[PDB]
Structures are given as structure tokens and as C-alpha cells.
């Protein structure tokens, strides 16, 4: 059976959210040995949803400038994070990954509607693919912000942010950013 | 018992060849081991006190892998980034005299011989020692 790095199962995962079920594609056919693929996913519209979500997480955390080309390094960081998530929580790392992505994704966004000069924003609904993208982006941004100047390690930082986002506590950067975004979206109307 | 060097993990093979240079004992060791740099592109001295036999192991194994190589060729192989200061960094070769006396001390033990072509390559005794040590590393890797 296909195992992530030859160790991680992919049949035990369950998707809580119906909205993100069709775009979080890791379950049966999309399970790969390595997150690295070097296959095209931005060639045409909606093709990046077919891409495994571990590859999305890999491609989204080397985004910062001085590490903008290193991808084997990135999947090594993802490996260390997944190991320490297993030895911390005990569950499968893909399950808690799916939970963090589901609970970190925003549901309503404020958007400028009108003209230049009217700063009054209107709250609009959120696409599920954009919800997945923003969840991964916020997780990666929290991983950066927790690992700037400390002994605390970047893979360990991604693990801590992922666990904090999945259990829903107000300690992940994604959770607090999503909560303030939701409350301002409610306040806009 | 048919094994070869390329079927042996390279870093452990270099380490074991350095250990063989220990328990062999004889090699022409310079009095400047504890003062010298190792390339003009490098900033500090090598951290390991016993770098000379490790570098000799790397030189011998690269000579086995590809022959017809001179001192300048090994100097080019051991190059890397010259941090040019605030200036943009470039590529720089290694130290000429260090690799030259490594080659001279390595042929001083009758492992390496001079080519008529102009280059320099390995003795049959050298390849016998190399695939013997490759045999020991293979035995210590496939059984551990």
C-alpha cells in the first residue's frame, strides 16, 4: 500500500467538513510516497485542487525569499514535523493536518464594494478552494512567525502551530487571525 | 566475496580509509598540520584535528574513480564558494601545496604511480587495498 514516506497511512483519515471534502484530496488515489512531484498544477484553472495537500503544504512554506528554491529541504522539514506530531499526539499526522486545515479556514470575507473613497466593506462568502489555500497560507505564516529568533525549531514550530490550530485553542496564529477576520466580517454587514 | 568501491557507501568508506591510514601508521606527515588553512576561499581551519588522512582518502578514492588527474585537477575538485566579502561570491579552487604533498606522501607509500600520459593514477596494490577496505565496510554494513 502507498504510505507517506513509506510510514504514514492514508486510509485512516476522515474529512469532517463536507465543503472541503472534494478539495482536500489525500484519501485514496492521491496518496503519494513523496510530497515532491514537480508536476504541473497551475497550467489550467482548478488543477491545483487535484494536487495532494501535503504537496500544497510543502510548496507553501518555502514561499519566503531566502528559501525560495529548496524543496527537498522542505519535505525534510515536513518529515520532522510529522514525526514529532506522531510522538506528541499519537494520532496520524494526516488526520490532525486535515483537522487544522478545516478549523483554520475562514468562512466569510470582508470585501471592498463600491468606489474608491468608500471604505465600507461588505461581507461575502468564501470559496472552498480559497478556504483551503488561506488555511495552508495561515499555517505556514504561523510557522514563520514562531520560528524567527529562538532555539525553537521550524519543523517543531509547524508541528506546534498545526496542533494548536487543530484542537481549536487560541494559540495558533491561524486561529486568532481567522477569529478576528470572522468577527470583522460579522461587524461589517 | 565480490564487492567493489562504488557498491560501498562513500562517506563511511572515506572514514574507514582514514582509519586504515591510522592503523597503517606510515605516511609523510607535515609539521604544518596544526597551522595551515585548506583553501583561500575558506575562512577557518578544519575542525577535525586529523584532516590530512581524510583528505588523502578522498584524493585516493577520486583517483580510483577517475584517473588521469593532476594536482591542479584535485585543486579544482576541492573548490567551492569564495565569499568575496561584501562583493558577490564566486567559485575558487583549493590549496595547491596541500594536495601536492598529499599526492607526494601517498605515492611515498607506493599506492600511486606516475603516468606517461602526463597525469597520475593508482597502483594495483592501491586497488587491492581499496576493494579490501570496501569488503570490510560491506561486511560491517550488510550485517549490522
Amino acid at each position: 500500500d502507498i504510505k507517506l514516506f513509506g510510514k504514514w497511512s492514508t486510509d485512516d483519515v476522515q474529512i469532517n467538513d463536507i465543503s472541503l471534502q472534494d478539495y482536500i484530496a489525500v484519501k485514496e488515489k492521491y496518496a503519494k510516497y513523496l510530497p515532491h512531484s514537480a508536476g504541473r498544477y497551475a497550467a489550467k484553472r482548478f488543477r491545483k485542487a487535484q494536487c495532494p495537500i501535503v504537496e500544497r503544504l510543502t510548496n507553501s512554506m518555502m514561499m519566503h525569499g531566502r528559501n525560495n528554491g529548496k524543496k527537498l529541504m522542505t519535505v525534510r522539514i515536513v518529515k520532522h514535523a510529522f514525526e514529532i506530531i506522531h510522538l506528541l499526539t499519537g494520532e496520524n499526522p494526516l488526520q490532525v493536518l486535515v483537522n487544522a486545515i478545516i478549523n483554520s479556514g475562514p468562512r466569510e470575507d470582508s470585501t471592498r464594494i463600491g468606489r474608491a473613497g468608500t471604505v465600507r466593506r461588505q461581507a461575502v462568502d468564501v470559496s472552498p478552494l480559497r478556504r483551503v489555500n488561506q488555511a495552508i497560507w495561515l499555517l505556514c505564516t504561523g510557522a514563520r512567525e514562531a520560528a524567527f529568533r529562538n532555539i525553537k525549531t521550524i519543523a517543531e514550530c509547524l508541528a506546534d502551530e498545526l496542533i494548536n490550530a487543530a484542537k481549536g485553542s487560541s494559540n495558533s496564529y491561524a486561529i486568532k487571525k481567522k477569529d478576528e477576520l470572522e468577527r470583522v466580517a460579522k461587524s461589517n454587514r | 566475496p565480490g564487492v567493489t568501491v562504488k557498491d560501498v557507501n562513500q562517506q563511511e568508506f572515506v572514514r574507514a580509509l582514514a582509519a586504515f591510514l591510522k592503523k597503517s601508521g606510515k605516511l609523510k606527515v607535515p609539521e604544518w598540520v596544526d597551522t595551515v588553512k585548506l583553501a583561500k576561499h575558506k575562512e577557518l581551519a578544519p575542525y577535525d584535528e586529523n584532516w590530512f588522512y581524510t583528505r588523502a582518502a578522498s584524493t585516493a578514492r577520486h583517483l580510483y574513480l577517475r584517473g588521469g588527474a593532476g594536482v591542479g585537477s584535485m585543486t579544482k575538485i576541492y573548490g567551492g564558494r569564495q565569499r568575496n566579502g561584501v562583493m558577490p561570491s564566486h567559485f575558487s579552487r583549493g590549496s595547491k601545496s596541500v594536495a601536492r604533498r598529499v599526492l607526494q606522501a601517498l605515492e611515498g607509500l607506493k599506492m600511486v604511480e606516475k603516468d606517461q600520459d602526463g597525469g597520475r593514477k593508482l597502483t594495483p596494490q592501491g586497488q587491492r587495498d581499496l576493494d579490501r577496505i570496501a569488503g570490510q565496510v560491506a561486511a560491517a554494513n550488510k550485517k549490522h
Partner: protein, 130 residues
Amino acid sequence: LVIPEKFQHILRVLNTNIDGRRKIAFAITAIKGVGRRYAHVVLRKADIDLTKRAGELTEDEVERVITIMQNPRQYKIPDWFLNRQKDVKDGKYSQVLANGLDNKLREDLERLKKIRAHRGLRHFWGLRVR
């Protein structure tokens, strides 16, 4: 490792404070006149292992490495690592030390003044030399 009972937290060498919790090479580097390279060479010639810490040292090792760093030529340190190769006055291969650096730059500045060269006058005005 273990708890060293004879630990010197702050050292005083050549009228200079040394942080004893730092590594021996970089604690010796911390004083003026010697960097990491000459510290590594003087430590390799002093037969002292690099791993152990500055406060985790005995007094004989400290005084003997001071003795090595005082007179490099007698202890087989070759004549290209030295700070001043050929002095104007006596031309002696010697290390310069912390207060020695201040005094030697002061007298170099003074001789550049009294010669009235371009470099001395540029230092007098206080502008860029190179």
C-alpha cells in the same frame, strides 16, 4: 558532562576581562589583538583540547597558553600569522597585545603626524584614508 568545582566564571588576563562560560577559542578571541584563527593555532600548539570551556581550565594550562601567546617565534609559530611583521624601529617578528595595540597605533599616528605625510594629515582631519 559533570559539575566542575574549580570553575572560574570571570577571568582577568592582560588587564582584560574574559567571560569564562564561553568556549576557550572564542573567549581568547574576545580579547583585543587575537581572533579565532590565531586562537585555534595557539591552542593546537598548546596541546589543549578545543571542547572544554574557559572557566573549566586549570591554572597551569592558562599560564602556559599565555606563555605560548607571548613569544610565538620560540614556540614554532611561523612568520606570516603575526600582526606586525617588520617594525619601523627594530623590525622584530612579534605579536601585539591589547594595550600594546593602543600604544602602537598611537605611536604610528604620532610618527605619521611628525613626518607630515598625506595619511597622517588625513587622519588628523579625520576623513577616509583608503
